[PDB]
């Protein structure tokens, strides 16, 4: 019943811009905290950004503060993530994360910076 | 109706057992009177009340 | 140690002053279940079974009798008849 | 068994009294049969039930 699907990925160069999406079904997004994780090849899965369930506070990881932007759309049941000032260290498969009872992981979309 | 003093005893006992049966379908404050949809649709520590 | 391998460190054969642990303001929540924290200094116990783990900051309300969650239903389950205190504080400055 | 009409009255009176006293080891659905271990670390608007 609950499923996250990810889109909006593509191939960009160093310093390009992109905007992902995480369309959700089976639950409203005004009640649950939302996260994103990424998997670089050869690296472990690391947390990217978060907005709480109230939609008030924003958090980011240490290397992505000041450059990435997280946005939420409660009307379309979709959470988006914005790319600015892309470096090739962020070459990863980006998964959106939510805890609705138990945590569900989408298949993600490959985003490469080259 | 000559035999009413035996018939009222059987009628009172039958109405007592049927009243005992018919209060199995009472919620007593519940969503449902059946245990199974209480156990299925509700989390078990707050299904305990 | 984290919640897949939550440490159980039992305490026995001592005198446990809980008025020191009550009046410390460093702890965020002090959810408790058995018999009063005013008379926690007044009674005597058989075993303690003290535990020690780190959760997420949104996973505070999972630590209760009969919750739901990947911590609650898959990793670390409390009984419905749990008698103890949950003592938690923020550890963003240490982790 | 000659004096059974006297003995069964004392037997059912004593066994009713014992069944009354044997009720005193029941929390009726609480956590424990000790009153303070029910009440006093639970918050006082939620141990009264």
UniProtKB/Swiss-Prot annotation, chains B, D:
Question: Record's superkingdom?
Answer: Viruses
Coiled coil: which residue ranges?
7-49
Impact of altering residue 40 to A? In strain: Alpha/B.1.1.7
Q: What is the effect of changing residue 8 to N?
A: In strain: Delta/B.1.617.2, Mu/B.1.621
Impact when changing residue 27 to K: In strain: Omicron/BA.1, Omicron/BA.2, Omicron/BA.2.12.1, Omicron/BA.2.75, Omicron/BA.4, Omicron/BA.5, Omicron/BQ.1.1, Omicron/XBB.1.5, Omicron/EG.5.1
What is the recorded function of this protein according to its Swiss-Prot or TrEMBL entry? Subunit of the fusion protein that is processed upon entry into the host cell. Mediates fusion of the virion and cellular membranes by functioning as a class I viral fusion protein. Contains a viral fusion peptide that is unmasked after S2 cleavage. This cleavage can occur at the cell membrane by host TMPRSS2 or during endocytosis by host CSTL. In either case, this triggers an extensive and irreversible conformational change that leads to fusion of the viral envelope with the cellular cytoplasmic membrane, releasing viral genomic RNA into the host cell cytoplasm.
* Name the record gives this protein: Spike protein S2'
Record organism: Severe acute respiratory syndrome coronavirus 2 (2019-nCoV)
Question: What gene is behind this protein?
Answer: S
Q: Which residues of the full protein are shown?
A: 943 to 991 of 1273
